[PDB]
Swiss-Prot record:
Protein name: Bis(5'-nucleosyl)-tetraphosphatase [symmetrical]
InterPro entries (alphabetical): ApaH, Calcineurin-like_PHP_ApaH, Metallo-depent_PP-like
Subunit structure: Monomer.
Catalysed reaction equations from the record: P(1),P(4)-bis(5'-adenosyl) tetraphosphate + H2O = 2 ADP + 2 H(+)
Biological process per Gene Ontology, one example term: nucleobase-containing small molecule interconversion
Signal peptide: none
Keyword annotations: Hydrolase
UniProt source species: Escherichia coli (strain K12)
Length: 269
């Protein structure tokens, strides 16, 4: 079976309880995770250990908090006490865990399921070939010995409009923001980097990225996490918002792909 789970955010107990609920069995089953494995919840260390141990039985995409953890680890960014990352950062296997984490994809595609996953979704300004090329470019910098330079360069809110003519720092920053920070778009598809509210609470003319028809969404289902204030609701057919806010006191959500059946684990917080 194929299971897809939204942002775990260190909620190790809830993740294991949910997987036991569906009798997740590596070798028979595959787990897709929308990223943001770490921060806020108490068990980022156990989450990373477990997910890495799954190997080919898990298909991960990196989220914005995963990238922030890598930035903290590399000395690029300051650790925030609220993220509860110190046990992971101080673990004897921190190097092993985080060097694995930075090699994971930003984008997962299953052609037989016609299924695409990224942390925040797929901007309507991207077709599939462009999404693939951009994911490959940023994954290459993240997997390289020089990844702290990219992590430092990734921070920024501009440019917010895609063009194949983009080059250099702006190209990487847009790619990173589209895959891991996107929520709202202007009517032309341009990213808004400030509003984090629910669609009903957002100011005009902002619309959810998935409310703007784009070539990937027209052919593929898209699963994503990230947007907790969406609460997994209000999406069109073929769009699966899996982040139901477990670390925030909401729930951890698991979708079984074969029958589109949902399983929910309440937050222990
Ligand atoms: N049910 C809810 N209703 C209304 N607001 C909610 C709800 N749940 C959480 N929030 C608030 O929503 C904010 C975004 O947190 P979040 O988990 O959605 O996203 P995260 O990526 O984990 C960090 P982020 O800095 O925001 O992401 P960005 O790429 O925009 O940079 C954060 O203040 C939360 O109090
Ligand atoms: Mn998140
Ligand atoms: Mn996120």
């Amino acid at each position: 079976a194929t299971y897809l789970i939204g942002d775990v955010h260190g909620c190790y107990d809830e993740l294991i309880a949910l997987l036991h609920k569906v009798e997740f069995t590596p070798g028979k089953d595959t787990l897709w995770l929308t990223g943001d494995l770490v921060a806020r919840g108490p068990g980022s260390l156990d989450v990373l250990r477990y997910v890495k141990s799954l190997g080919d039985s898990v298909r991960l995409v990196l989220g914005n908090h995963d990238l922030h953890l890598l930035a903290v680890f590399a000395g690029i960014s300051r650790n925030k006490p609220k993220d509860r990352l110190t046990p992971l950062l101080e673990a004897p296997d921190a190097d092993e865990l985080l060097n694995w984490l930075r090699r994971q994809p930003l984008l997962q595609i299953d052609e037989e399921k016609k299924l695409v996953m990224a942390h925040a979704g797929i901007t309507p300004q991207w077709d599939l070939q462009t999404a693939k090329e951009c994911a490959r470019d940023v994954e290459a910098v993240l997997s390289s010995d020089s990844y702290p330079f990219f992590l430092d360069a990734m921070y920024g809110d501009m440019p917010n409009n895609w063009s194949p003519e983009l080059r250099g720092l702006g190209r990487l920053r847009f790619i990173t923001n589209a895959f891991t920070r996107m929520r709202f778009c202007f009517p032309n598809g341009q990213l808004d980097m400030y509003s984090k509210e629910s669609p009903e609470e957002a100011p005009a003319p902002l619309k959810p990225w998935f409310a703007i028809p784009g070539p990937v969404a027209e052919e593929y289902s898209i699963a994503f996490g990230h947007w907790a204030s969406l609460e997994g609701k209000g999406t069109p057919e073929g769009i699966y918002a899996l982040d139901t806010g477990c670390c925030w006191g909401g729930t951890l959500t698991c979708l079984r792909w074969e029958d589109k059946q949902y399983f929910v684990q309440p937050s222990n917080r």
